[PDB]
Amino acid sequence: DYKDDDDKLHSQANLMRLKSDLFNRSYPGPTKDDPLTVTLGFTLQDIVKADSSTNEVDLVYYEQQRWKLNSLMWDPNEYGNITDFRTSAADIWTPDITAYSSTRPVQVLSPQIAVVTHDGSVMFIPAQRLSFMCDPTGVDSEEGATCAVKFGSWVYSGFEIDLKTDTDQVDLSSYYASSKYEILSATQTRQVQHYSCCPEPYIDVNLVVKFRER
Amino acid sequence: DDDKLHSQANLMRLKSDLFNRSMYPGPTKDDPLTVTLGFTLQDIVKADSSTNEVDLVYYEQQRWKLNSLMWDPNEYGNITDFRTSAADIWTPDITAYSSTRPVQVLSPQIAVVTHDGSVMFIPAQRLSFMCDPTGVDSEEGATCAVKFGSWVYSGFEIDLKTDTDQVDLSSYYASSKYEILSATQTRQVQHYSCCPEPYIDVNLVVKFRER
Amino acid sequence: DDDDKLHSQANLMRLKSDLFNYPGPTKDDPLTVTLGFTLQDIVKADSSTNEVDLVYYEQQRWKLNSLMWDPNEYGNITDFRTSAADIWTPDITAYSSTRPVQVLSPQIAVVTHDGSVMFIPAQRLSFMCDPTGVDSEEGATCAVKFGSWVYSGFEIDLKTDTDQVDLSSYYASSKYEILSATQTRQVQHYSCCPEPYIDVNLVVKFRERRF
Amino acid sequence: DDDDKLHSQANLMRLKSDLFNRSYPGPTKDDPLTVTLGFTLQDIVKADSSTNEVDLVYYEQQRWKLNSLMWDPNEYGNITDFRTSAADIWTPDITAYSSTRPVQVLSPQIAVVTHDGSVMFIPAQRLSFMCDPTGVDSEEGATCAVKFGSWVYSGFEIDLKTDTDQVDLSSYYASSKYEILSATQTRQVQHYSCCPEPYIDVNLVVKFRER
Amino acid sequence: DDDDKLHSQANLMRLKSDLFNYPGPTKDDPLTVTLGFTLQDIVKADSSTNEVDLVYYEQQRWKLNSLMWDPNEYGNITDFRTSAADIWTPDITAYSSTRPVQVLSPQIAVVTHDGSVMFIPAQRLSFMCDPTGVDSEEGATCAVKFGSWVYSGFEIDLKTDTDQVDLSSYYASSKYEILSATQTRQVQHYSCCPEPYIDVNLVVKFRER
Numbered sequence A: 001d002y003k004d005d006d007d008k009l010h011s012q013a014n015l016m017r018l019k020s021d022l023f024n025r026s027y028p029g030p031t032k033d034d035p036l037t038v039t040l041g042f043t044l045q046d047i048v049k050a051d052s053s054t055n056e057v058d059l060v061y062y063e064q065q066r067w068k069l070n071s072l073m074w075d076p077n078e079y080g081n082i083t084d085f086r087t088s089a090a091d092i093w094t095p096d097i098t099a100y101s102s103t104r105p106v107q108v109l110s111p112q113i114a115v116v117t118h119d120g121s122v123m124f125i126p127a128q129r130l131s132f133m134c135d136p137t138g139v140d141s142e143e144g145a146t147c148a149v150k151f152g153s154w155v156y157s158g159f160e161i162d163l164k165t166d167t168d169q170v171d172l173s174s175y176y177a178s179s180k181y182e183i184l185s186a187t188q189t190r191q192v193q194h195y196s197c198c199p200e201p202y203i204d205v206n207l208v209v210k211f212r213e214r
Numbered sequence B: 001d002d003d004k005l006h007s008q009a010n011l012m013r014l015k016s017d018l019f020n021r022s023m024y025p026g027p028t029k030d031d032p033l034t035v036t037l038g039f040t041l042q043d044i045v046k047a048d049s050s051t052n053e054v055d056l057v058y059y060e061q062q063r064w065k066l067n068s069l070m071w072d073p074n075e076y077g078n079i080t081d082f083r084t085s086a087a088d089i090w091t092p093d094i095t096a097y098s099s100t101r102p103v104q105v106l107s108p109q110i111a112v113v114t115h116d117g118s119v120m121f122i123p124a125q126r127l128s129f130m131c132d133p134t135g136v137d138s139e140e141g142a143t144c145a146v147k148f149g150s151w152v153y154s155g156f157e158i159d160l161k162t163d164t165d166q167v168d169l170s171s172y173y174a175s176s177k178y179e180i181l182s183a184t185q186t187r188q189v190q191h192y193s194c195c196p197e198p199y200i201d202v203n204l205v206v207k208f209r210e211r
Numbered sequence C: 001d002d003d004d005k006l007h008s009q010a011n012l013m014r015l016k017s018d019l020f021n022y023p024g025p026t027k028d029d030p031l032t033v034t035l036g037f038t039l040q041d042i043v044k045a046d047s048s049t050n051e052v053d054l055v056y057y058e059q060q061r062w063k064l065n066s067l068m069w070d071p072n073e074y075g076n077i078t079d080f081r082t083s084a085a086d087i088w089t090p091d092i093t094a095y096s097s098t099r100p101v102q103v104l105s106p107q108i109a110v111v112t113h114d115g116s117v118m119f120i121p122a123q124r125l126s127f128m129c130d131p132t133g134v135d136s137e138e139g140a141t142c143a144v145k146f147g148s149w150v151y152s153g154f155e156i157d158l159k160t161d162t163d164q165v166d167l168s169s170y171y172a173s174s175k176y177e178i179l180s181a182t183q184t185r186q187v188q189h190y191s192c193c194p195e196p197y198i199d200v201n202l203v204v205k206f207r208e209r210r211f
Numbered sequence D: 001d002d003d004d005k006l007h008s009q010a011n012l013m014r015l016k017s018d019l020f021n022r023s024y025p026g027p028t029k030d031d032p033l034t035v036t037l038g039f040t041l042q043d044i045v046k047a048d049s050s051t052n053e054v055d056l057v058y059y060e061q062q063r064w065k066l067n068s069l070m071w072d073p074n075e076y077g078n079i080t081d082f083r084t085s086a087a088d089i090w091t092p093d094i095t096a097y098s099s100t101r102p103v104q105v106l107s108p109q110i111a112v113v114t115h116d117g118s119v120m121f122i123p124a125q126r127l128s129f130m131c132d133p134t135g136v137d138s139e140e141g142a143t144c145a146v147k148f149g150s151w152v153y154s155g156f157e158i159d160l161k162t163d164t165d166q167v168d169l170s171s172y173y174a175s176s177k178y179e180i181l182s183a184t185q186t187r188q189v190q191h192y193s194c195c196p197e198p199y200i201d202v203n204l205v206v207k208f209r210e211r
Numbered sequence E: 001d002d003d004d005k006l007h008s009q010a011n012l013m014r015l016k017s018d019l020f021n022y023p024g025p026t027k028d029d030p031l032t033v034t035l036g037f038t039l040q041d042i043v044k045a046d047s048s049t050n051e052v053d054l055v056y057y058e059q060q061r062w063k064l065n066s067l068m069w070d071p072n073e074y075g076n077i078t079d080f081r082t083s084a085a086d087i088w089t090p091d092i093t094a095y096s097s098t099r100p101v102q103v104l105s106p107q108i109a110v111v112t113h114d115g116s117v118m119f120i121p122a123q124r125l126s127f128m129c130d131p132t133g134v135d136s137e138e139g140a141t142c143a144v145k146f147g148s149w150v151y152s153g154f155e156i157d158l159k160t161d162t163d164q165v166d167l168s169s170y171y172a173s174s175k176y177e178i179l180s181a182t183q184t185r186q187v188q189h190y191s192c193c194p195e196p197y198i199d200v201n202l203v204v205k206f207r208e209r
């Protein structure tokens, strides 16, 4: 009725005001004094192509990214019980998580939209097709081939951005059942590197996939 | 000539009243939206048995209705609908769940808005998706499927529906390398252990064989 | 002498400011778009996917009262070149493409004082075409319709000046020779709806260049 | 000395602001422009006899002069030239008339502007164009040609010139799959049956053979 | 507690505001760009077109007086990360590419309080290279020069810290093994023209593994 109509109008107004209060009335990225931990997890959907002439393999996966900022916190009571909202990834800071051994620019398969929750947590899940350095020799064997690719910030050291995983098991529950390649194992493991150049520690998540022709 | 100038004026006024004035932030649990989807399959262009990818060309009809897009035609020279850039309005984030390449858009990004607040948007797309074409060279043919739905909105914010579960095949290319044996489009509701919300998709299932 | 050149520059800048400082056609204010093709090359015929690649220049012409001016009010300027982004342009689309059109020319149009616009995009188009018989005397025949994506014949009409495609610039050393090429206005109806839909059907008969 | 360097930056920022922010609508019949063109051919990368397309890599030197880009160096700390993004200034729409794919740009889009109003802009490009490479595997080689000129400006608005009819081969890749027998670049006044006003082009003719 | 973090953010926002409120190098205000390559992979060698595809990280470093600050004035901030669109970057270009470079990393740079900027684009490059001999003990040798497209040595000098390409990240299971890889500053002089031209010549000797 008129009341219900008003409730929907109010909710829209509350959401606009919240987004206004948060964005254009107020993030420069993490710092050594304010470091950020980004949680990463992979959902491997398909090994599309294994190219033995170039040693490039093409994966399709969803990369779940999570982080939390005090600057994105709000009290739902102050905004009509809004507890989360969807917003363009361009409206907010997002981490520069990059494959370290790609051979072509990553191709994005999903909308650039994130979910922000009232505790300041952000969830962003880009689907990607990636070509990366991988020798598929042995893919036509019982033990298959094994390849790996590291993901992490391009420009922030372990001083500013840390990474974590919730599990070292890649999510395979959406893996394409009729892929040319069957997955024997898939793991995701945080690593901390020290290079002789630099005093800063460097952090990545290493995606290791063991696979064979089905 | 002055009559047409007035019609031009009424349309510019309508669009400015609706857009450059008035703030729809997308759907929410308190203001949920139903998007109607329908496919018109034009061609299976390519089936790649080395990678198990198949390439489709189709028109994806999308329809939804917003109170914020309603007007009284009597206040605007009896204008009952208009065409506008899809960039001028909210559009749903309907995504193929098992694509293997970014969708390629084949048509202009323009929508039709009607006075009741309904919007119709029909992007033509070329899609590569995960599909094993084994059997395509047999009488039984091959069967593949791809789900479409919102990437970021659950069934609490966006629901989906179809007007028919039969894919429109009236524009299917008569001399395609592949003949269609059947094509269906079916709403599915899924509940996951992770999550209390329902998740909705439209499953496009195509059975086809070499012609 | 160069004083005159400064004055002509200022007049043109003032004209463009006055014109640019249109919501598309409507049933009350319909527009006729004239189309014509200049076929330059059949680049590729792919029998594995039934796609053929053409390179052509597509002539588009239309006329808007809103683009009219009196040359005497603007230092006798009769026409100007401008970015296609500065003006409304018709959403003329191939109906059976299989890849996005690739644009081969600058997106710049010519506007004349009577409000007429001429815009000539060069394009490479892949479209649905079975090239069977291309290696024979009779050759292969394919066709592709072009028209508005979103406007009916009650908002945009189409016309051609001739039903003969211009072949005078067709590449003399193409892999494919043209047997004929026509461009024909068609009026289509769909069962749901009383309004006519208009397209221009490009039909090309061709064979491999070699009794 | 660091004071001097700060002054130089200030002077350049002020010059650019004066030229771009506080001050050209392209050439016209009253104010026509001459563009000088010159090609430096770097490589014939690929010759495709299946589609009759050949791929070139070259640098295209473009030079023109505008009164609107003139300054007195004395008013700007003796600055005689500057580099600037090609987006900041008008640039000519020089286009290959027989490309089969959009040209791919290989160099930064930055031009050099000199105090007399002259501009030099040298885009490196990879171009696929219409070319039958028959004879490439013989002593006499293959011959192909491609015209470059304005897409939309007739010879009444844009004229072209060359400094030499000899293509610069001094940077030609010495281990290319193809050796160059000759390469010429020749101004032409080109009449099209579509159009009463001629267009000016520079015709690049390359004779080449497998190494 | 969190007031400390609220302060550091405010300090960084203040710094970025003060710095971003430069027209490129000139003969009067010249710049030095240091370049270094980390060669990751020879992906493809195409003997039908004489094009070879490299993947590498290209380190670029320069310093601007205009980007200097005292850390003590901004809560001891000594560096920050910023979009490469926020700042001037050098027009370093391969001189014999055959396709546009494809960028594999985010366009973000690090600015340090001494005015130095480090920008490290990862790239895939196709360039002119004849792979003949790659299947022999001696392998094949190719080369590609990198340098500014529009600035002479009077505006941008180039240099390398070492003439040895960094091979410590070279892909161990590449189709091609690297025999040597050098990056060498070259100065070119022409009779027409007073100005020196500078490039860094990347020379790679490689063979089938």
Ligand SMILES: *[C@@H]1O[C@H](CO)[C@@H](O[C@@H]2O[C@H](CO)[C@@H](O[C@@H]3O[C@H](CO[C@H]4O[C@H](CO)[C@@H](O)[C@H](O)[C@@H]4O)[C@@H](O)[C@H](O[C@H]4O[C@H](CO)[C@@H](O)[C@H](O)[C@@H]4O)[C@@H]3O)[C@H](O)[C@H]2NC(C)=O)[C@H](O)[C@H]1NC(C)=O
Pocket: B074, B077, B078
């Ligand atoms: C925008 O669109 C609206 C809606 O269609 C138009 O408004 C209509 O205008 C027509 C034409 O003037 C009207 O038709 C006339 O209706 C009369 C009776 O009207 C009463 O009854 C109707 C229905 O119950 C009510 O809607 C209305 O409010 C009235 O109470 C007839 O007597 C008229 O017939 C006579 O005139 C015609 C010529 O016009 C002759 O040919 C006949 O022989 C006869 O002498 C006539 O049919 C209609 O009532 C209006 N509809 C509504 C809903 O208001 C606008 O005209 C249109 N344009 C603009 C600019 O707004």
Ligand SMILES: COC(=O)[C@H]1[C@@H](OC(=O)c2ccccc2)C[C@@H]2CC[C@H]1N2C
Pocket: A100, A153, A154, A155, A156, A202, E036, E038, E057, E059, E119, E120
């Ligand atoms: C800004 O670029 C980097 O820091 C990269 C890289 O940096 C370099 O390779 C490099 C090269 C020359 C000088 C300094 C750093 C190290 C690790 C691996 C990828 C990424 N990274 C965090």
Ligand SMILES: COC(=O)[C@H]1[C@@H](OC(=O)c2ccccc2)C[C@@H]2CC[C@H]1N2C
Pocket: C036, C038, C057, C059, C119, C120, D097, D149, D150, D151, D152, D192, D194, D195, D199
């Ligand atoms: C505006 O487009 C043109 O003038 C093109 C072309 O125009 C046409 O082909 C054409 C066809 C029909 C009507 C008007 C122009 C003429 C020459 C060749 C390419 C380009 N041009 C300089």
Ligand SMILES: *[C@@H]1O[C@H](CO)[C@@H](O)[C@H](O)[C@H]1NC(C)=O
Pocket: C071, C072, C073, C074, C075, C076
């Ligand atoms: C345009 O030309 C006509 C020719 O008589 C002339 O009368 C008129 O003054 C000119 N218009 C101006 C604005 O230069």
